[PDB]
Amino acid sequence: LLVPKLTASVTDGAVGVTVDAPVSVTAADGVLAAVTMVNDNGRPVAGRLSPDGLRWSTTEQLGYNRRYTLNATALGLGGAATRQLTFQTSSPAHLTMPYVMPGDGEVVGVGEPVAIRFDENIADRGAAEKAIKITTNPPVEGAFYWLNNREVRWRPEHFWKPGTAVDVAVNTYGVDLGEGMFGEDNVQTHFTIGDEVIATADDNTKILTVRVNGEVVKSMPTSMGKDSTPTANGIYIVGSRYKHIIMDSSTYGVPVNSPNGYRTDVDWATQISYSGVFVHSAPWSVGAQGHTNTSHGCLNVSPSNAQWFYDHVKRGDIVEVVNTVGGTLPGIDGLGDWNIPWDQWRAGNAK
Ligand SMILES: *[Se]c1ccccc1C(=O)Nc1ccccc1
Ligand SMILES: [N+]
Ligand SMILES: [N+]
């Protein structure tokens, strides 16, 4: 007769076993009659046996720097076979935790990139990218690009089509992200693209025009950066929205006590760059809005229009600035992703 054969997904005596996959045992020419797995302290590991008795797998994630011992017995008409296997899992030098935006279940605008931010510098960007699975429906091509040593972004060539579902699975637990840095955990988030909302601030008219699904719905007189502190041209992604916010220049790098510093409370403020540009209520400049530029870079509008903007724009909507005397918003600003040409974005910078 034929003696049962056992096949494990680990080898006895292995070291550095990664914990990004379950551990399995398979029987052939027989069935699994006993399968147990314990850690170094004797703590059992939860598992599940298939109804046909041929396949057993762990059902909870295994830990770092552990020693596991697997005992399996297979029985068949032709005899019995028993094996004992002991293996050692990865021993990270450090862990890093990923943080994903936008939030799970959110509806966002057509400019919203997927963002994965780690709390440590990532030595092996390629490994991180390979560990992140992005599903889109309808499917569209996209690509990864790193804004700095810790945050990676994914987006398509053109703005998203409304109604697209986007699923983000960051499967970094057990993955070596370089230099002994392993993922602290997995994260899973899902979001959806809503209406197309694109607002254009044209320096030639000093008007901020809001288009919803292609139709002009609001035309807002604005005052942008004066010549000495101009507003940069380019594509801005709407970020966070505030009924009011204490605008403190030191958050954007400039001491309040410096000549260009400031600390003032502002109403109805919508963030459009990490450098600190907002659409906001500006009662002090209503006389100049629609005529001349008087601000330090923000888009000043009236209180009523700033509240309208707050109420009708969402994270990931788009503000485009054109014809100013400024330069172009940096692509790595944090909300300036779309100013990177697609060929450069697509090629990436994983190194
Ligand atoms: Se931008 C902005 C938006 C609302 C209120 C104030 C500002 C601002 O930057 N003010 C400022 C900049 C530099 C020096 C003084 C004041
Ligand atoms: N983001
Ligand atoms: N992907």
Residue numbers in the entry: 57 to 407
Question: What does the paper behind this entry write?
Answer:
In M. tuberculosis, the cell wall contains high levels of 3 → 3 (meso-Dap–meso-Dap) cross-links (approx. 80% at stationary phase), which are formed by the l,d-transpeptidases (Ldts) (ESI†).6 Evidence has emerged that LdtMt2, in particular, plays an important role in the virulence of M. tuberculosis, as disruption of the ldtMt2 gene results in altered morphology and inhibition of colony growth. Mechanistically, the Ldts differ from the PBPs through their use of a nucleophilic cysteine rather than serine during catalysis. Several β-lactam antibiotics, in particular carbapenems, have been shown to inhibit the activity of LdtMt2 and to have anti-TB activity. Such LdtMt2 inhibition involves covalent modification of the nucleophilic cysteine (Cys354), which reacts with β-lactam antibiotics to give (a) stable acyl–enzyme complex(es). Consistent with previous reports, the structure of LdtMt2 consists of two N-terminal immunoglobulin fold-related domains and a C-terminal catalytic domain.
Structural studies on LdtMt2 with potent inhibitor ebselen reveal opening of the benzisoselenazolone ring by a nucleophilic cysteine, forming a complex involving extensive hydrophobic interactions with a substrate-binding loop. LdtMt2 crystals were soaked with ebselen, and the structure of the complex was solved by molecular replacement (ESI†). In both protein chains in the ASU, electron density consistent with the presence of a single ebselen-derived adduct was observed extending from Cys354. While a single ebselen conformation was refined in chain B (conformation II), two different conformations were refined in chain A (conformations I and II). The ratio of conformations I and II in chain A appeared to depend on the length of time that LdtMt2 crystals were soaked with ebselen, with the conformation corresponding to that observed in chain B (i.e., conformation II) predominating at longer time points (data not shown). Extensive hydrophobic interactions are apparent between both aromatic rings of ebselen and the LdtMt2 active site in conformations I and II. In addition to Val333, Phe334 and His352, residues from the mobile active-site loop (a two-stranded β-sheet encompassing residues 300–323) including Met303, Tyr308, Tyr318, and Thr320, contribute to the hydrophobic pocket around Cys354. Apparent pi-stacking between the phenol ring of Tyr318 and the ebselen-derived phenyl ring proximal to Cys354 (ring A in Fig. 2A) is present in conformations I and II; this interaction has also been observed in the complex derived from LdtMt2 and 5,5′-dithiobis-(2-nitrobenzoic acid). The position of the ebselen-derived phenyl ring distal to Cys354 (ring B) depends on the conformation of ebselen; in conformation I, ring B appears to pi-stack with His352, while in conformation II, it interacts primarily with Val333.
